[PDB]
Design a protein around this nucleic acid. Sequence first.
DNA 1: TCAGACTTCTCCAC
DNA 2: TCTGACTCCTGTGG
DNA 3: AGGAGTCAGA
DNA 4: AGAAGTCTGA
Lengths: 153, 154
Amino acid sequence: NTKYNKEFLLYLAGFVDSDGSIIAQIKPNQSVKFKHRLQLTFDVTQKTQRRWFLDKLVDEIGVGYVADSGSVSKYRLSEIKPLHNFLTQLQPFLKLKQKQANLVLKIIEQLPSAKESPDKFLEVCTWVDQIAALNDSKTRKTTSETVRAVLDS
Amino acid sequence: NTKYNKEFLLYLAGFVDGDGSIIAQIKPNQSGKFKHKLSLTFKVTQKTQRRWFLDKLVDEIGVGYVYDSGSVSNYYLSEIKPLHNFLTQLQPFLKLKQKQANLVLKIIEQLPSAKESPDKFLEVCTWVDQVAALNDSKTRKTTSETVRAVLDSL
DNA sequence: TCAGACTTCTCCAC
DNA sequence: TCTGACTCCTGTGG
DNA sequence: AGGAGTCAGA
DNA sequence: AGAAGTCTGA
Ligand SMILES: [Mn+2]
Ligand SMILES: [Mn+2]
Ligand SMILES: [Mn+2]
């Protein structure tokens, strides 16, 4: 549980609201209990010509990785515990994507209790539905009603 | 002049490095002195759905305007004096676009003397060239060499 | 002449 | 089983 | 920007 | 994002 400086959070929040991304998605996975798994991602995108700016971000946040997919590099943070601690400190400064951040923090906290009952898991998938709604979702496939249909068995 | 908060300039600078833009242009103008107009510009682009975010910027910055361009809206500020005052305070927090700001501040400061001699104007035009190079320039047309062509004809 | 307001275009960086 | 690192695609909003 | 997907080790 | 432009009043 490392603590981040206010000025670092201030600048970064503005960068995240612009070119950053807070993603929640439901992934198909037969080996898991309900054939579906939850993935929370904190994403910052920048062209590889400025990969360095994403590299400092790894050192400054402390945790996370950076990957290239051609002309574009991406800072990513999917690890649950650091994700929570980070978004908790970044949240008050978000102006555009504040809702999504708090919606993720809500999911991460309800992660244990959501593996219990099917109706509870679908309730958490509902929280995922809200995040993609707030985002400019265009390529989404697996939603809460996708889980529901498979969960009719 | 107006003094801006540090928490405001910190966030915004991050947002400028993200979705903001700092432009320098050489506009062709037949009625001008050297047949060319200079236009320094500070832009923030966002989806029209989030126009309210750009609207607040007019309030928090105190100047500037917000127009549409399809599904996209733009916050603009080309007014020479509050632009100098704004970027002067914004610059120390920029990371990705700090060089572009300090060049804009350079041009604006040496603007009145830029009309004296063609050689003093051309030099300022190469300072516009530097700015475009730093930017992800794609569809540019008028450059410092475009001026040189027109000017060295007379 | 000049500078401020306003509109349009386009390619890649998200 | 299950988390997390990793890669790849798509369509705008920069 | 916002998803889709794979895969190995724990 | 980073340009290209028009037009008006002073
Ligand atoms: Mn953006
Ligand atoms: Mn950008
Ligand atoms: Mn952007």
